[PDB]
Amino acid sequence: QNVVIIDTGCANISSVKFAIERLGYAVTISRDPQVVLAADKLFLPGVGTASEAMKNLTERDLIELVKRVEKPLLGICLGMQLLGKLSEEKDEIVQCLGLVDGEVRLLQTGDLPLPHMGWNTVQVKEGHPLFNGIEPDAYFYFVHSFAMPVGDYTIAQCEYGQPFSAAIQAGNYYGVQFHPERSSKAGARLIQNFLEL
Numbered sequence: 623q624n625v626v627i628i629d630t631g632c633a634n635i636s637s638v639k640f641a642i643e644r645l646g647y648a649v650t651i652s653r654d655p656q657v658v659l660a661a662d663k664l665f666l667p668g669v670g671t672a673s674e675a676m677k678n679l680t681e682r683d684l685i686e687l688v689k690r691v692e693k694p695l696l697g698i699c700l701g702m703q704l705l706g707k708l709s710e711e712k713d714e715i716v717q718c719l720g721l722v723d724g725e726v727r728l729l730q731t732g733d734l735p736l737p738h739m740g741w742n743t744v745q746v747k748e749g750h751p752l753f754n755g756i757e758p759d760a761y762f763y764f765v766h767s768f769a770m771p772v773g774d775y776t777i778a779q780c781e782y783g784q785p786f787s788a789a790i791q792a793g794n795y796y797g798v799q800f801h802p803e804r805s806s807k808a809g810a811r812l813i814q815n816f817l818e819l
Contacts, residue, residue, distance in 0.1 A: 623817055626661035628688065629653040630678055630701075634667040634803075638698065641803040645814050653682050655690075663817055664691055668700030672709035672716040672726065672768075675700055688719060694794050696816050699766060702790065702797025706770055722792040724770040731783030737767035742800075744778040744788040752777065752789065752796065752815050760808040762788070762800035769799060 625647050627635055639649045642665075652658055666688065668675045679685050688695075697705050709716045709726035718726070729738060741761040746753045769786035772779055778789035780799070790797040796816065802809030 623647060624650070624660060624662040625665075625817065626650045626652055626658055626663070627665045627667065628658060628684065628695075630666070630668055630675070630682065630684070632667055632669050632678075634669050634698065634801075637803045638665055638667050641810065641813055642817070645810065645817065647817060653684055653687070655687055658687060659690065659692075662693055663819075664693060664695035666695055666697040666701040666704065668698070668704060670700065671711065672700065672703060672718060673711060673714075675704055676716055676718060679704070685719070689721065692794055694796060694816065694819050696813075697795070697797040698803070699799060699801055702799055703768065703770065705790070705792070705795050705797050709768060712767075721795045722770075722775050722790055722797070724773050724775055724787065724790065726768050726770050729767060729769050729783060729786065734783045737765055738769070738780075738782045739765045742780055742782065744780050744800075746778045746789075747776070750777045750789075750791075751819060752791075752812060754815050756808055756811050756815075762798075762802065762805040762808055762812075764788075764800045766799055 776787045780788035
């Protein structure tokens with residue numbers, strides 16, 4: 623596979639790259655349209671707030687490019703949230719890429735601590751290939767206070783105070799709310815599954 627991590631220039635890239643290289647794949651880091659559009663598989667990382675991330679995407683001339691991508695793309699955590707229509711702040715509503723018809727909102731966890739942080743299981747839509755060979759009771763590592771509600775785009779659900787989307791898909795755009803690069807063997811297999819689609 624020709625693998626490209628879209629160069630948002632954030633701190634998560636090296637850990638993502640490491641996880642992919644450990645699986646035997648060479649990784650290219652680029653924001654060049656030709657290089658990106660030639661890839662077989664794309665990763666979209668991110669950290670911080672949606673406002674800063676959308677600002678970063680704009681300044682790096684990546685808004686229109688991400689929208690043009692036709693091959694499978696995996697957004698991780700904030701990378702996933704950027705695919706949706708909008709995101710709250712905690713304040714203004716931040717307009718995101720709008721590639722998935724979902725919104726990102728603050729989790730209402732009651733007396734439960736924020737962020738949703740730690741190791742949790744997910745409940746997968748029957749037979750989705752992203753989770754092939756991963757047991758239902760496997761743990762992924764989450765660290766997020768905002769989330770996308772369950773909707774038509776949801777391919778894995780998680781429950782923490784309220785149900786939310788642990789993973790999503792819209793055509794070639796995939797997203798995970800947890801960090802597979804920090805989720806040990808379960809996360810490694812999900813990354814491998816994505817690369818093997």
